[PDB]
Design an enzyme around this catalytic site. Structure first.
Site, mmCIF file in Angstrom:
data_model
loop_
_atom_site.group_PDB
_atom_site.id
_atom_site.type_symbol
_atom_site.label_atom_id
_atom_site.label_comp_id
_atom_site.label_asym_id
_atom_site.label_seq_id
_atom_site.Cartn_x
_atom_site.Cartn_y
_atom_site.Cartn_z
ATOM 1 N N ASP A 92 -31.917 17.651 -87.825
ATOM 2 C CA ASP A 92 -33.229 17.962 -88.376
ATOM 3 C C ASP A 92 -33.205 19.354 -88.976
ATOM 4 O O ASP A 92 -32.417 20.190 -88.555
ATOM 5 C CB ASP A 92 -34.299 17.868 -87.297
ATOM 6 C CG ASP A 92 -34.475 16.454 -86.774
ATOM 7 O OD1 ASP A 92 -35.284 16.271 -85.842
ATOM 8 O OD2 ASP A 92 -33.807 15.534 -87.297
ATOM 9 N N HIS A 116 -27.878 24.974 -97.797
ATOM 10 C CA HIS A 116 -27.201 25.705 -96.744
ATOM 11 C C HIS A 116 -27.484 25.058 -95.397
ATOM 12 O O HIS A 116 -26.579 24.892 -94.585
ATOM 13 C CB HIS A 116 -27.649 27.162 -96.697
ATOM 14 C CG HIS A 116 -27.089 27.906 -95.529
ATOM 15 N ND1 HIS A 116 -25.791 28.364 -95.496
ATOM 16 C CD2 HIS A 116 -27.620 28.188 -94.315
ATOM 17 C CE1 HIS A 116 -25.544 28.893 -94.310
ATOM 18 N NE2 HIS A 116 -26.635 28.796 -93.576
ATOM 19 N N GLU A 117 -28.746 24.694 -95.181
ATOM 20 C CA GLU A 117 -29.200 24.068 -93.936
ATOM 21 C C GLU A 117 -28.660 22.669 -93.688
ATOM 22 O O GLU A 117 -28.454 22.287 -92.541
ATOM 23 C CB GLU A 117 -30.730 24.031 -93.899
ATOM 24 C CG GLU A 117 -31.366 25.411 -93.916
ATOM 25 C CD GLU A 117 -31.112 26.194 -92.645
ATOM 26 O OE1 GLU A 117 -31.106 27.442 -92.701
ATOM 27 O OE2 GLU A 117 -30.938 25.567 -91.586
ATOM 28 N N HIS A 120 -25.461 22.708 -91.904
ATOM 29 C CA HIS A 120 -25.535 22.677 -90.448
ATOM 30 C C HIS A 120 -25.856 21.261 -89.987
ATOM 31 O O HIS A 120 -25.247 20.751 -89.060
ATOM 32 C CB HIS A 120 -26.625 23.621 -89.932
ATOM 33 C CG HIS A 120 -26.354 25.069 -90.198
ATOM 34 N ND1 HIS A 120 -25.145 25.663 -89.905
ATOM 35 C CD2 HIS A 120 -27.149 26.050 -90.683
ATOM 36 C CE1 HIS A 120 -25.208 26.949 -90.195
ATOM 37 N NE2 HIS A 120 -26.415 27.209 -90.667
ATOM 38 N N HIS A 126 -21.285 28.834 -89.641
ATOM 39 C CA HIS A 126 -21.201 29.878 -90.649
ATOM 40 C C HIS A 126 -19.800 30.209 -91.119
ATOM 41 O O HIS A 126 -18.843 30.186 -90.342
ATOM 42 C CB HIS A 126 -21.882 31.143 -90.145
ATOM 43 C CG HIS A 126 -23.370 31.106 -90.270
ATOM 44 N ND1 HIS A 126 -24.187 32.074 -89.736
ATOM 45 C CD2 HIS A 126 -24.189 30.212 -90.873
ATOM 46 C CE1 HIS A 126 -25.447 31.780 -89.998
ATOM 47 N NE2 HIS A 126 -25.474 30.655 -90.689
HETATM 48 C C1 LIG Z 1 -28.501 30.186 -87.101
HETATM 49 C C2 LIG Z 1 -29.973 30.319 -87.558
HETATM 50 C C3 LIG Z 1 -30.707 31.286 -86.630
HETATM 51 C C4 LIG Z 1 -30.069 30.827 -89.013
HETATM 52 N N1 LIG Z 1 -31.481 30.927 -89.463
HETATM 53 S S1 LIG Z 1 -31.993 32.076 -90.672
HETATM 54 O O1 LIG Z 1 -33.392 31.806 -90.838
HETATM 55 O O2 LIG Z 1 -31.644 33.340 -90.097
HETATM 56 C C5 LIG Z 1 -31.079 31.810 -92.199
HETATM 57 C C6 LIG Z 1 -31.097 30.525 -92.834
HETATM 58 C C7 LIG Z 1 -30.359 30.301 -94.036
HETATM 59 C C8 LIG Z 1 -29.582 31.360 -94.629
HETATM 60 C C9 LIG Z 1 -28.787 31.113 -95.896
HETATM 61 C C10 LIG Z 1 -27.424 31.576 -95.996
HETATM 62 C C11 LIG Z 1 -26.658 31.348 -97.175
HETATM 63 C C12 LIG Z 1 -27.231 30.651 -98.283
HETATM 64 N N2 LIG Z 1 -26.428 30.464 -99.397
HETATM 65 C C13 LIG Z 1 -26.737 30.870 -100.686
HETATM 66 O O3 LIG Z 1 -27.848 31.328 -101.021
HETATM 67 C C14 LIG Z 1 -25.707 30.735 -101.635
HETATM 68 C C15 LIG Z 1 -26.038 30.805 -103.031
HETATM 69 C C16 LIG Z 1 -24.766 30.633 -103.592
HETATM 70 C C17 LIG Z 1 -24.376 30.592 -104.970
HETATM 71 C C18 LIG Z 1 -22.987 30.397 -105.287
HETATM 72 C C19 LIG Z 1 -22.014 30.236 -104.242
HETATM 73 C C20 LIG Z 1 -22.424 30.278 -102.868
HETATM 74 C C21 LIG Z 1 -23.818 30.470 -102.533
HETATM 75 O O4 LIG Z 1 -24.379 30.539 -101.324
HETATM 76 C C22 LIG Z 1 -28.593 30.182 -98.199
HETATM 77 C C23 LIG Z 1 -29.354 30.415 -97.015
HETATM 78 C C24 LIG Z 1 -29.574 32.655 -93.983
HETATM 79 C C25 LIG Z 1 -30.316 32.880 -92.775
HETATM 80 C C26 LIG Z 1 -29.291 29.909 -89.946
HETATM 81 O O5 LIG Z 1 -29.418 28.671 -89.917
HETATM 82 O O6 LIG Z 1 -28.534 30.398 -90.789
HETATM 83 CA CA LIG Z 2 -32.466 13.769 -86.326
HETATM 84 ZN ZN LIG Z 3 -26.911 29.184 -91.471
#
Ligand SMILES: CC(C)[C@H](NS(=O)(=O)c1ccc(-c2ccc(NC(=O)c3cc4ccccc4o3)cc2)cc1)C(=O)O
Ligand SMILES: [Ca+2]
Ligand SMILES: [Zn+2]
Ligand SMILES: [Ca+2]
Ligand SMILES: [Ca+2]
Ligand SMILES: [Zn+2]
Length: 162
Positions: A92, A116-117, A120, A126
């Site tokens: 989810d 990104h999500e 997971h 990561h």
């Molecule tokens: C564990 C929990 C607590 C954590 N929750 S959190 O709310 O802190 C969080 C959630 C999502 C991200 C996050 C990280 C990386 C991306 N990626 C990009 O934007 C991106 C753009 C992009 C463009 C070209 C090539 C690669 C690329 O990558 C997008 C979103 C960063 C932090 C998590 O799931 O990561």
């Molecule tokens: Ca589910």
């Molecule tokens: Zn993440």
């Protein structure tokens, strides 16, 4: 890439339980669909949106405590998270509505987070490669096209193959 358990099936389902006020139902649907295609284009994984009932990956927009004791924190900080593969909460993905979501750059591009999500959701952790999608930090490229970095292709494929 980094893996901590993957889905035993290739055809997964998803449901959009609710919508954020920041975008149209259409913008949201288009952004998640595209996010799913990122991984479907490089593995045998197929995704089918369902409209009612329980799906493998349930997508909802919430704030503070929203049903799983992993509360969000209002503006800034956490924006979203998802559970690894498994039943019920597994896979989810929840998005903090105290954040501004967009199809462009003024706020958090929904497509990029969701992509990104669902990394997971499918079983990825990561990355240590700064240019990976699964890297822990979000970024906007200012470009129209998005090609899944070789590292996530490697990661995702190490779990489901080409
Ligand atoms: C564990 C929990 C607590 C954590 N929750 S959190 O709310 O802190 C969080 C959630 C999502 C991200 C996050 C990280 C990386 C991306 N990626 C990009 O934007 C991106 C753009 C992009 C463009 C070209 C090539 C690669 C690329 O990558 C997008 C979103 C960063 C932090 C998590 O799931 O990561
Ligand atoms: Ca589910
Ligand atoms: Zn993440
Ligand atoms: Ca937040
Ligand atoms: Ca919002
Ligand atoms: Zn949650």
């Amino acid at each position: 890439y980094n893996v901590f358990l993957k889905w035993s099936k290739m055809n997964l389902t998803y449901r959009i339980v609710n919508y954020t006020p920041d975008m149209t139902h259409s913008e949201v649907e288009k952004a998640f669909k595209k996010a799913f295609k990122v991984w479907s284009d490089v593995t045998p994984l197929n995704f089918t949106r369902l409209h009612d009932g329980i799906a493998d990956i349930m997508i909802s927009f919430g704030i503070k405590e929203h049903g799983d004791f992993y509360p969000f924190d209002g503006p800034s900080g956490l924006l979203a998270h998802a559970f690894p593969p498994g039943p019920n909460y597994g896979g989810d993905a929840h998005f903090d509505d105290d954040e501004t979501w967009t199809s462009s750059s003024k706020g958090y591009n929904l497509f990029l987070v969701a992509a990104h999500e669902f990394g997971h959701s499918l079983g990825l952790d990561h990355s240590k490669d700064p240019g990976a999608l699964m890297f822990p930090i979000y970024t906007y490229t200012g470009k129209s096209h998005f090609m899944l970095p070789d590292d996530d292709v490697q990661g995702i494929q190490s779990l489901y193959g080409p």
